RNA sequence: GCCUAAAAUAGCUUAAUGCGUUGGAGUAAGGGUUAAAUCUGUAAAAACCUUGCAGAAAGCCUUAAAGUAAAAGCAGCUAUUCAUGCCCAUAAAACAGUCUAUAAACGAGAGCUGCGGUAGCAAAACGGAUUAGAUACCCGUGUAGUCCCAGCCGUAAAUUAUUUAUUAAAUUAAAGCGCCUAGCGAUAUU
């Protein structure tokens, strides 16, 4: 019998894994353009984008499973101290806060 | 004609003793309670009814030829050795002795406690 | 709190109720 | 003295389907033993529990001794027997 | 039972809550056809036709049937109850409708025979059936809402409706909105089968049944709002008994009520029994609506005269 | 993931019993999976019977299977064996997705080159 | 479900034998809870009670215990 | 990569119990009390071997909770969704704090509306006893309720005040708050 490399493929890659994971893979690729190097997964440009797209995936994720509480205020927590990063940065690093927002498309309303 | 084996079954919940004879595939052929002795009310807890209605069972298993028996017994109660010695002094003779006491996994709700 | 305490509160409330259930059913409650 | 296994051995075989190892860890009567006497650490206490529980809902095991159920000792013996003939002769 | 608090929630969809704004429209609560997807409209021609209304006439021009006529035109549509000409044949629903002769909803079901042309028919709407589904019958189908078997192919507890008296008659017996029966037993040529009405009855195992319910869950929500609602349906007005004069009913009298209820014939109404003791259907009924054993019904004046 | 699904039959004929594993397979190859693993057990002798509303089973017919495939298989195979008359009754459980851990694998080649390296 | 087997019509041995059973395997215990209900509330107070006059006996036979293991008393 | 007495969602298992349940066998009691009786049976009960149907709950493991789920709370099995916790290996040049005037969300048990269900238990209710009386405690029946889904209500003897430094605790000194000023007394007014 002969090998199937093609198989192997599939099992290694994305397609037999639970959807967070999938989820969770687009959102560090997506942050390849605002890094600061090929490693960088905690700088503030990189913290505030994963943060906002989390946001978007669990919008859909809370229209159908209503009832869910303990998920939603774990977002909602996330979702204040979100506000306060980018209104530090503003007061102190006014050209990295221009480039957050540009690049995800807010808002400058993070004021004191 | 004495060649039969049964099976002797002994419930005890605290209040009677019920003693009932039955053959090995489940058909009864008697029964007694110390009521049908002659103690009542009251006077149906005590050992000496027990014993009274063990022997009175004994008498009519030989009668009906069941010699060797084996005593399941269901519940916790102190009546129960009083019967199965009984029975053995009786003339009857025991061969093995088996607690089938049920436990519910769970199960219904009891009633509640009396706050006498 | 002292179950002392707890016992002087208990007879109001309860003279409190009763007057609330009795005029439960009435026109003109009685005040 | 009576045997024990080792912990290396109770991780790699703590299946519900190995109802035979399983039974070490089970009283006469059928219940699960406590860890004071099985000699087990946490995690391994929780799998050989659930093991039982999960054996128990697929009818590999019974939840306490069956009087209908006592031939079951012989046919087991009987079965052993065959399967080590019939692999001796292979 | 209907409360005013519960048309101010307006909670339960499919219904139509009407604002309070005139004194005929406070306490009406109608049925949404159009959120539900049911059609209202004109009925199939070639299974239709249009009828007079008889106001409970008879042959001889007598009343016999009290309170109705004067109200709208009168259509009837044709329902197959049984489909054994169709049996092979699967059907597809193109509609699900509204008859304001019955309490349930029908279904049009078209069928291709191979060789000929589409036919058409109507039927009552199982619980759970929509616009594209498939429908099938005889042997051979799945046990599933809106599938037609033989009692001899059926599971003790699942639910069925439009149930056969009689091989091949047709479904007579569950076909109000929302009702359903049960098989609890089959002996050797006869089921046992609780009605909708809790009685136990026997039925021969060559009798055909659907899988399912009737397809209207909101009967029981609905208020008229209006004497003039029921008028357009076709329901007249009625005069209470002790509100007439002596030679018109038992209780015409100025005094309300001088003797036991009765009907306006003398009868007693409230608890007498009407059934033939000796009917010849007693072999088939167990036990009648209740938990009265037949036999209890059967003999007992025998026993009072004896 | 990887799953493994243990199934008791009633003991009929192989036929029978093919047709039933037949089912679950096609339904993984349908989704986009693979099956690792197919094996059975013959007729075995329960700890009790196994009752339906008019019979008892006292043996059934045990066998299993090991699949890889998206998560949403799990309710399609538990589907196909409610639907299927011939099943008695059945688990499926999930694995670890790996035999070895990253550790072990760096270990391994820790070694490899330390050889190399005397070498 | 526990079967004791009766030998040289010994009767007495068999029914020692059913009590150790019921002690040993928890018998006793289901009884006694099903007997009559208790919240939860009132069942830990149960329980505390129960535990306590466990603690009281161990804690008296320890003291007998050091004094044979001294004074090698024959009690 | 694994784990979970976490939450939501969906399938599955039965020890016991109940009956206007099936068939066999058998005949006077069963049940309950300090002592009795009401009640269930002899027109075939209870007990014993079998058949059917149904609801609720989860023995041993099992122990604190050592999870701390934010609090209310949480352990029958399997899976999905999602959020934690563990190991091993990484990451940030500028950003992230405490407290809460004000505002919002979550929130036991009982209770209210609609829908489905109703075994066991049990307010109310009706009988039998006890007693000077028993309008209670005890015994027999027993409806709401307890259960599922969608809403309302927002109340508990509903845990130890919060934070920094020291500390096993403790103690010592500070930061930002809420509350108390003898008791007694309202269905005051808004
Ligand atoms: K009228
Ligand atoms: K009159
Ligand atoms: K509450
Ligand atoms: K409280
Ligand atoms: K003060
Ligand atoms: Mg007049």
Request: aromatic residues 6%; charged residues 30%.
């Amino acid at each position: 019998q002969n090998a199937k490399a093609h198989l192997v493929e599939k099992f290694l890659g994305p397609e037999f894994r639970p959807r967070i994971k999938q989820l969770k893979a687009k959102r560090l690729e997506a942050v390849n353009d605002i890094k600061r190097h090929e490693a960088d997964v905690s700088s503030p440009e990189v913290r505030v984008s994963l943060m906002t797209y989390r946001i978007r995936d669990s919008i859909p994720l809370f229209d159908e499973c209503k009832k869910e509480l303990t998920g939603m205020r774990k977002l909602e927590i996330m979702f204040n101290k979100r506000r306060r990063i980018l209104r530090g940065l503003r007061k102190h690093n006014f050209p990295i806060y221009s480039m957050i927002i540009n690049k995800l498309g807010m808002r400058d309303i993070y004021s004191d | 004609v004495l060649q039969l084996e049964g099976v002797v079954h002994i419930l005890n919940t605290s209040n009677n003793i019920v003693l009932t004879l039955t053959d090995k595939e489940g058909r009864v052929k008697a029964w007694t309670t110390p009521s049908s002795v002659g103690y009542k009310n009251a006077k149906k807890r005590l050992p000496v009814a027990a014993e009274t209605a063990a022997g009175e069972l004994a008498k009519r298993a030989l009668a009906l030829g069941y010699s060797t028996v084996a005593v399941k017994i269901k519940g916790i109660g102190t009546m129960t050795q009083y019967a199965v010695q009984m029975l053995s002094s009786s003339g009857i003779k025991i061969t093995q002795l088996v607690d089938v006491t049920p436990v519910p996994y769970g199960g219904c709700r009891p009633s509640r406690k009396r706050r006498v | 709190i002292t179950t002392m305490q707890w016992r002087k509160l208990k007879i109001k409330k309860h003279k409190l109720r009763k007057r609330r259930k009795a005029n439960r059913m009435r026109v003109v409650k009685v005040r | 003295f009576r045997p024990r296994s080792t912990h290396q051995e109770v991780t790699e075989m703590a299946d519900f389907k190995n109802v035979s190892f399983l039974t070490q860890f089970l009283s006469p009567a059928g219940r699960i033993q406590p860890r004071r006497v099985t000699k087990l650490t946490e995690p391994l206490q929780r799998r050989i529990a659930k093991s039982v529980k999960l054996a128990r809902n697929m009818a590999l095991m019974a939840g306490e001794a069956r009087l209908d159920k006592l031939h079951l000792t012989r046919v087991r013996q009987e079965e052993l027997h065959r399967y080590q003939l019939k692999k001796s002769v292979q | 039972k209907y409360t005013y608090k519960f048309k101010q929630a307006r909670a339960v969809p499919g219904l139509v809550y009407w604002k309070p704004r005139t004194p005929g429209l406070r306490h009406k609560i109608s049925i949404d056809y159009d959120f539900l997807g049911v059609y209202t409209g004109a009925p199939h021609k070639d299974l239709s036709a249009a009828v007079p209304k008889l106001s409970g006439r008879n042959n001889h021009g007598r009343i016999t049937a009290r309170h109705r006529g004067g109200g709208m035109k009168k259509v009837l549509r044709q329902v197959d109850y049984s489909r054994e000409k169709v049996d092979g044949i699967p059907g597809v629903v193109e509609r699900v409708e509204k008859d304001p002769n019955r309490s349930g909803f029908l279904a049009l079901v078209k069928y291709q025979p191979e060789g000929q042309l589409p036919i058409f028919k109507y039927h009552l709407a199982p619980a759970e059936i929509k616009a594209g589904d498939v429908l099938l019958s005889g042997d051979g189908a799945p046990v599933q809402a809106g599938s037609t078997l033989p009692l001899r192919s059926i599971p003790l507890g699942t639910p069925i409706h439009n149930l056969e008296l009689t091989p091949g008659k047709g479904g007579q017996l569950a076909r109000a909105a929302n009702v359903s029966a049960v098989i609890q037993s089959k002996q050797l040529e006869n089921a046992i089968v609780k009605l909708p009405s809790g009685e136990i009855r026997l039925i021969n195992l060559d009798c055909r049944a659907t899988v399912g319910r009737v397809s209207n869950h909101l009967q029981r929500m609905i208020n008229y709002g209006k004497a003039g609602e029921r008028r357009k349906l076709g329901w007249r007005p009625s005069v209470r008994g002790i509100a007439k004069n002596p030679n018109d009913h038992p209780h015409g009298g100025r005094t309300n009520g001088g003797r036991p209820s009765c009907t306006p014939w003398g009868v007693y109404c409230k608890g007498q029994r009407t059934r033939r003791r000796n009917n010849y259907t007693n072999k088939f009924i167990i036990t009648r609506k209740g938990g009265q054993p037949i036999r209890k019904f059967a003999e007992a004046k025998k026993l009072k005269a004896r | 993931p990887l799953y493994e699904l243990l199934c008791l039959a009633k003991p009929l004929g192989k036929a029978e019993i093919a047709g039933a594993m037949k089912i679950v397979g096609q339904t993984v190859l349908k989704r986009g999976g693979f099956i690792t693993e197919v094996q059975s057990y013959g007729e075995q002798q329960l700890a009790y019977d196994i009752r339906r509303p008019f019979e008892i089973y006292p043996s059934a017919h045990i066998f299993k299977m090991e699949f890889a495939a998206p998560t949403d298989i799990v309710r399609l195979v538990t589907h196909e064996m409610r639907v299927n008359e011939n099943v008695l009754r059945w688990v499926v459980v999930r694995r670890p997705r790996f035999k070895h851990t990253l550790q072990e694998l760096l270990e391994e080649v820790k070694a490899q080159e330390n050889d190399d390296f005397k070498a | 479900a526990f079967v004791a087997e009766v030998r040289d019509g010994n009767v007495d041995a068999a029914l020692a034998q059913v009590k150790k059973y019921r002690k040993t395997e928890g018998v006793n215990d289901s009884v006694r809870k099903k007997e009559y209900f208790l919240r939860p509330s009132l069942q830990k107070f149960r329980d505390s009670e129960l535990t306590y006059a466990k603690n009281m006996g161990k804690l008296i036979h320890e003291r007998v215990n050091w004094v044979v293991k001294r004074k090698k008393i024959k009690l």
